Amino acid sequence: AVTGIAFDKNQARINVRGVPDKPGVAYQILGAVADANIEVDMIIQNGTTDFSFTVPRGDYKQTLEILSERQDSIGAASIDGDDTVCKVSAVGLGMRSHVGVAAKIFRTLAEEGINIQMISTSEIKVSVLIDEKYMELATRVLHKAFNL
Amino acid sequence: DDNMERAAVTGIAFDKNQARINVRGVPDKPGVAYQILGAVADANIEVDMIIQNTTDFSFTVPRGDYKQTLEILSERQDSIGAASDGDDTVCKVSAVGLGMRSHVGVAAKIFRTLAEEGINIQMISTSEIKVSVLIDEKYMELATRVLHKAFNL
Ligand SMILES: [Ca+2]
Ligand SMILES: [Ca+2]
Hints:
Chain A: Belongs to the aspartokinase family. Two copies of one chain form a homodimer. Helix content of chain A is 28%, strand content 32%.
């Protein structure tokens, strides 16, 4: 089911707030980001809507400046971010089958009172964005929770 | 951008066998999110696209398990801090990211195509490993055609 726990501090969250819910919006945000050729990892979305995504920590300032200038188009209420988050992953080949992973990791991080900001799942991995100060804790909590 | 070709699973999946649950009105006192999902996982329902953008939880379930999820979360809704709705006319579009050098070109494209046809993205949920979105099931054939065209299948 779950064979390893990975973690990675090279993360920055970026938020685009209260953007009109029309087609083409997502593209506008990302396309801007992808022509500065910065990689983007997680993306999360939803008469308004909110668009959160992750950027390698080193691209935090540029991304905010790319969106600051394209805030005209897009037309967002606010643009903020967080460069003190990190990603922690439950990883294991042979997994999609086992269903209570999202739940279990939520449950276990909940006990330690550590807020999950974002989640993404797949056959191969399940990942959460949390504040960096929880990284070790979360890794250890989860590592325990899955018997190594 | 050769990335779609590099994908190991080169393609876009369309799943009309899905339904969106929106658990509305949730307070921020102890691990309430778990009672939500553990209740769904105990019934052995598989879950995907968990979002929390003072804030609500939203997710997807195979369509054949919607009438059950709704009820499992219904008779536990005044046991969990819960004010309120689901949606069983959604279709999930997804591409798998393992193998791709970059994943953002593909995602921005996927978004651009749907935009050009006036198809609105209901929910996004993507990472290095999978790029997935939610659109209205009425656009499924249209989405398949324009997306197949855009990535040459
Ligand atoms: Ca800072
Ligand atoms: Ca912090």
